Symmetry: D3
Subunit: 338 residues, 6 copies
Amino acid sequence: SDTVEWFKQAKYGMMIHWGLYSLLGGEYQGKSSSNYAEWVQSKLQIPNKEYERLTQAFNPIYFDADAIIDLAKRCGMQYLVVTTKHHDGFAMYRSLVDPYNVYDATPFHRDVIGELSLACRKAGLRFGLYYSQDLDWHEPDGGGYLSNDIETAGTTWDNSWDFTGEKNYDRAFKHKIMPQIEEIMSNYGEISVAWFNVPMTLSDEQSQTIYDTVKRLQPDCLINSRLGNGRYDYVSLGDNEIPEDSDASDKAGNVDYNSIEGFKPSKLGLYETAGTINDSWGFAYHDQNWKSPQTIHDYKAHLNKYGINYLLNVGLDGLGRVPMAAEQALLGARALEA
Amino acid sequence: GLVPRGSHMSDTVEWFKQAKYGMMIHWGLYSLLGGEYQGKSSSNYAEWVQSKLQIPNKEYERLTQAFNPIYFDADAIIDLAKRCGMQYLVVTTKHHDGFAMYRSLVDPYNVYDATPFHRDVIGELSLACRKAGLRFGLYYSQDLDWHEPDGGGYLSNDIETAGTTWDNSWDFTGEKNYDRAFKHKIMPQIEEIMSNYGEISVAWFNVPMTLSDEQSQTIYDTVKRLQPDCLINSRLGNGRYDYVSLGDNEIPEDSDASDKATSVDYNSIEGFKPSKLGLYETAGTINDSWGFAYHDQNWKSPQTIHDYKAHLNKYGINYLLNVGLDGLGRVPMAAEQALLGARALEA
Amino acid sequence: SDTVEWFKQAKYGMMIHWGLYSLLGGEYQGKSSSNYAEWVQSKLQIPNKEYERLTQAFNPIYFDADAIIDLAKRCGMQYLVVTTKHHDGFAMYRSLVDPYNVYDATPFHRDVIGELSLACRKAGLRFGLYYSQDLDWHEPDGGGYLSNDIETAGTTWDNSWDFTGEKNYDRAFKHKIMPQIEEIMSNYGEISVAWFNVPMTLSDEQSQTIYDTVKRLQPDCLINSRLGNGRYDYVSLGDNEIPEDSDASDKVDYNSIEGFKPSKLGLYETAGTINDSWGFAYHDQNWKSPQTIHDYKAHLNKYGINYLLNVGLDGLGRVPMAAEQALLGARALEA
Amino acid sequence: SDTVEWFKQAKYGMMIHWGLYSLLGGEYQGKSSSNYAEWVQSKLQIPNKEYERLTQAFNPIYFDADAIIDLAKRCGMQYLVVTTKHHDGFAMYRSLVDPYNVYDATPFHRDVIGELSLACRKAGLRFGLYYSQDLDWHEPDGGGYLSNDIETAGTTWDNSWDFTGEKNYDRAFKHKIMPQIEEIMSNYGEISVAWFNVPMTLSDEQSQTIYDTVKRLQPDCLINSRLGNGRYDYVSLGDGLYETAGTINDSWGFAYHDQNWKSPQTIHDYKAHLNKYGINYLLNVGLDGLGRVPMAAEQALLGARALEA
Amino acid sequence: SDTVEWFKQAKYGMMIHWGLYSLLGGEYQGKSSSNYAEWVQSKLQIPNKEYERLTQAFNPIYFDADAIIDLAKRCGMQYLVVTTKHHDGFAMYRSLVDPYNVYDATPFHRDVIGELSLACRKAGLRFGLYYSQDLDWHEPDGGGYLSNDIETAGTTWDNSWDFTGEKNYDRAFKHKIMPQIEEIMSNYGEISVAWFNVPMTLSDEQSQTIYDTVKRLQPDCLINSRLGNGRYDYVSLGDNEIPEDSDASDKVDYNSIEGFKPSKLGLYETAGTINDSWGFAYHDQNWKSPQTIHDYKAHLNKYGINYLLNVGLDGLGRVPMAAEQALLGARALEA
Amino acid sequence: SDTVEWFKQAKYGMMIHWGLYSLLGGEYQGKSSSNYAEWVQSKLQIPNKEYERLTQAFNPIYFDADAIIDLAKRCGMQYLVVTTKHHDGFAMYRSLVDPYNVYDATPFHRDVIGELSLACRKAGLRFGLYYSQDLDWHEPDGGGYLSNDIETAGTTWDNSWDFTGEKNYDRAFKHKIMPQIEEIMSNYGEISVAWFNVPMTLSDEQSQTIYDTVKRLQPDCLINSRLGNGRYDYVSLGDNEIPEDSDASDKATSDGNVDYNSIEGFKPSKLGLYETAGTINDSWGFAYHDQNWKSPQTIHDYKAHLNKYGINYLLNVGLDGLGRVPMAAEQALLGARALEA
Ligand SMILES: [Mg+2]
């Protein structure tokens, strides 16, 4: 495969997390998110009716897809993966299936995914899509409701505060998850990476259905291991997981295909660690724990030396900007390369 | 204590002498930028960003369309002040960028007319203060106005600032005459704010870089005409004041605080000046900025706030402690917690 | 079927009529509707161009799905059936097929059906959907143009004033009716009741096509007899029809809307109004008393007939005070 | 005075009550107004924060000033008196003094008083203005706070729920009442009638200041006996120049549940009785939330006209 | 076919070009083109990001579909063919597939094609649709990038200023072109004429796919020769092509847009403009006289060729006065 | 006066006509304006209720004050005079007195006069304001109702179709005219020229009141003769009036009394100041169907002829509905500039 040989040498990509959570920036009504500001709805059990009010404050006058792609290109990043829909269920593209999206529901009235697709194509960057296929806090049958024995970066995995009755993920899978995956894999050109997440609920068959649908629409798209249940083309390591040299040299009993930490089998020999510059995925006002240029440089070098890609995230602010400290960290790391 | 119903029975002078502690609010379009613009930093003063980065008015004005602070709640801000034992609240009606935070008939560059928010922030804070029994004060940039070709500061650019120049020297590069801005915008807006928001206890002017003694006097007399009990700070300039504002964050050492010595540049903003009435105030910040600044997390501790307040008050100096609201109209969590923490150290 | 045994014992449901007609409230340009305010467009032959202007006045700041469902629940009602689209053709949900709907066309910019679905699910009420499958005054090929020998609550059954040429219901059936039924039966979760109406035009095959489509998307949904042509799971009696003992003890024009019809499953329902209109009507204060509501309910239920009692929400999205008081009063008469 | 001789023979006028209260139509949160729907904010102590939400629902697509005036004219009404601002304090004209008004605060974004002024002038009806000078539930210092020993069509005369501190009408008088009276008596052409309330709170001096201001701006405007200043042009009789104001049903504001409309014959007979004694009949219409004359009101008026020949 | 015999005797139709280009009227930011105003994005290489801003200025308060159709009818025109989407890629109908359209993207918030469809039906005019199936300057994979039959020479017509990389029309064909053709052939009633254009990229198979899809959805729709590759029911001559007697009496590059081509059914049409532009152009006052229009029509018709005469509406939705007067004047020259 | 010596040598200025009429562009319901497209409301007796609909179509995304001033400057024009309010009564600035204005009533929501003032100041062009003090078709008491024996570029001078009863200009003078003049002479910096028009109704006292008000607010502002009644600082000739050599030499059209409220010919000028305002085509407002653009040579020669007699040439641009200078207008202006050394 051309995509396979490409991904093996791609080395470095930019990830983007952006959504309504970015406006809150890790604070709400005088209380804090966890280190993951994008989990704030769960952490503080924000009712959908309240969280939806953020739509009216979403008018990011500084968002400029071409400028973001240009920054990625100047840093030597070869692909960009963006949140089409995170756990809160809010789509960052024009979804016919669900009007809870950036185009229909906000004054911004623009398809963010559309703009980033176009910018990537112009600049010659490959384009990837993140989608929360399991969790959806906007849906009564969103995933996570069987997993609450496992601690989260919020409270529960699912929206357990608005929705307290019988739940069946199958219904959300059929009505929202699969239709939206069809939208994003149809409407934005060639997709090189599909980034799924936290497969807490979906069955082997549901993972397979997604896998097959993605490949039908996007034959060369690489799917990451967090689609769950062994249905994937490359392995995502844990959040910010920089494996020890020894373990990265082995890339290594039973594997839990739905765990998100550590190595898993990879027939194609493809691996990626997604990481953050500070400690959040979403923008977080009070997290100034930005990794230094030296740290970023060394993480990238270590991953790449062992055949692992580094997908480094930017959490855009409420105005659509790369935080200055994020940009300076990225450019600083780039300056340390020959 | 002989006043009309609805007024404070304590005379403003005796009140201010014992007031000890007030809240200041800085809020405007600069709060959206939060100390950054196009990948570049403000100075420590995020509200100075327009000058620091010479942002053209045509660009800066675009911020109006992003100003929809759905979490602004005047009653909640007043409640925080009151529970912390603050006895007054002083709010930016218009800062150096020239953008009004009230419904100005004189100038549509304001929060009511120019933003989707379409609400009179000063009006809401006035009403909240009245309901809670807090005295209400108004900050107004009478000299600098970066939205006005004749805004002040154009004679002062030999002196370093928290931006670049004192004036807007990038959009406006020709002949300038502050007198025109004084007549057309400054005096009319002062008349608005001193007329339309009830009883005003404090008038907080700033950086008197340009206005003449006569212009200072004209302001002083107009404020007193509209608001006979309003106390005016020393940064109106030229000796026209009722109380002395110390420097920004100026906590004088015991010896200086005791002596308050002057035997004076009336247009300087540092150090003591004469006060016939014996009234003094230090305005300070919880972090290092007046406006909200995303990258300034240097929040003073509860203990520091408590100690600063106690030190100032022991020497008869009031502490006016600022909150820079964010773009959504919120008190930053660390600021709220610092204030509540300081309150917990009293009893 | 679980839905069958449920419906047999459900006894009592709330119906909702709400639309652009609710703003007019039974008056337009100084003239009155009939007793049916929701028929005003036909009664007064309001041109579509004029009627559509109502969209801009539709901003019901007091609409609260949770509060409506809570009132139903407090009254012992076990299900709620709501107008997704009445005869005027205006959809009260986000229809991709047709932008003449509450989400796309009004400042309210909210999916009313979506909000009611969510509220019903949270409170454990079963949810039903009303759809005018035959009449559509917004469509040149809307039904009713073969039926004008039969008296109406307006003028004609069809829009005969904007559309005066050749008509063919098959075109509207294909392009609007079936696609919208697919939307409402796909996008709002489990649907327990489908309430069709006034089958003045559609063929046996068209009734069957709807029936099959509803069952495909909603296997447990019970369909009422006004789908027409014998394609149904339960019998709807006439509007406000409280049957006399002889007929009710015993329980055929399949497209008539009055009287009994065969019911293989033994399921029956009378839909009624608290006043005399389905839609909100400013000048109709003829509210049935608590005792009348109580007695109608008891009478219907003793024959195994469900009582589906309608509320016509006002232009602000409110239950009229007199309607709320009637319902709560009736509930107070149960021991 | 030309206005004096005119008013003596005018016989019949239309009054209009219209405001945010008209949207509620005598109900709020499942509770009733009294017979006076326009008093609902007081009756049910609706907080200003909640009541103000009505602004967003105010888009009366059927409001047509020319059509209202044409109805008045066809019935032989010679003047129209309209609510510029009722007790709730919401102005139905573009007020520079206060943005709580129909132009600035609603999607309708139109000056209702302006449109009615123009319509009256085109049709040759004299134009009159009603203004609540004492009560103002939108103002902390609105009047009524000395009068709560007297029962009302609501609860208290003042807003006693949002505003619970010291009250001094002098402040509202200076900042809102006098400035708004100056607006309405300046910006809408010749005003023939000024309709104020019976003063619960104003001083003699304040009533006099209003009288003098009106006459200064509108030298031919008639002031009636309600104003309380002790100088007036005509006597406002119960709710040689005289006028009785009345309603067609029992509410001033539109009230969905009041269908107690007076018959054509009643209106005809009442008007004839008043006119035989040299009393003008000022008959109110309460427009609905869409800006319409209720059908039964229109039918009553035209019916009464048909009984004259 | 009924449409075949109808088209043979129809003789005279109205064409409408209307879009964002109509606002610019051949001028843009200190530049101008006297070529076809609807081509201004290409002729002045206006970036999509700039051109899109025109959406916010599009509020044609004078647009009145009934009035346009009534003008056509009074002139004896028997059909109306309107731009659903021209080369700039902006749809003049509510497209689910692409929000770059007059309903979703402009304050006008109205379906222009929908309104014209309804107006035509009421007046008894047949309705036709123009769609740019090949060029689409809003799409990176829009057609035009393969120089048609002449090597290089500047003879590409894609958007080559915004989109400079490798291109594959098949992607746009699948994702935008075919879905939109399905929309317009599904959602606007009976379509009598399909007017395609400049087939310089699509394959014979792609032409066939369009042809078959149009016929599936609209069995009576006649397709013009500019669909390309021989897939058509009638021959479109060149723009404004008034053939000489010799050529007209006699009547092959299937993808050329000039001259005669074989016509099994004997159906032919020349589309022409009243001035020299299809879209409205501020500076083009070169209006043909009544006499010229009359004589062109007679010349075309005497050879069995229909005359499809275009109106370019202005930015307010109006027929330019000189255009209306030319058309009515030509009508006055008929008995 | 500095302004007097300045105006005498200024020679050449730009005028701007822009308003709701620019959207119609001289056509309405299939009917034509006269040569003056800005008079279309009167020509076709458009009811105010209908004309007001134009506000919702006014969103001129290509308006750029700096670019308009830059064109003026490139052509050697030394001042710019813009319509704050023409006969239709629609204000092109934020008027507190009247919400029928470009800021309050249109999606554009921008103060056109404010933007032009700022652009003029940055570029060092003097700034002038046009205001229709007499006619106002939006006001029942607008002027013109005594003058309908005299033909116009529409029908009547006044709005005689919406307003058919008794009229008294005094009311409009007090409530709209004087307050708006106060606004525009207060809120837009130093004003060098005040351009009034068609003084069909106002009295000598009313002309004087305006004159005094303008001078109070703008001491150095030069007021043109169309204020009426002899109350002026310089003489405006007729529309597009290029006087014959003999008359231009004498600065006189006849030997006796002048009519101070006529708009044609010379009048006395104590300060020796004169100006002809003219058009590039035949309309003041933008006109879709008027392509009768004067040639570069004509513009050059008109300017030279006027200037040789100490008469200024104030040449108008009628912006289109998008806020643009028509290309043919720009090309005529730059063409004329090219013919100067
Ligand atoms: Mg009274």
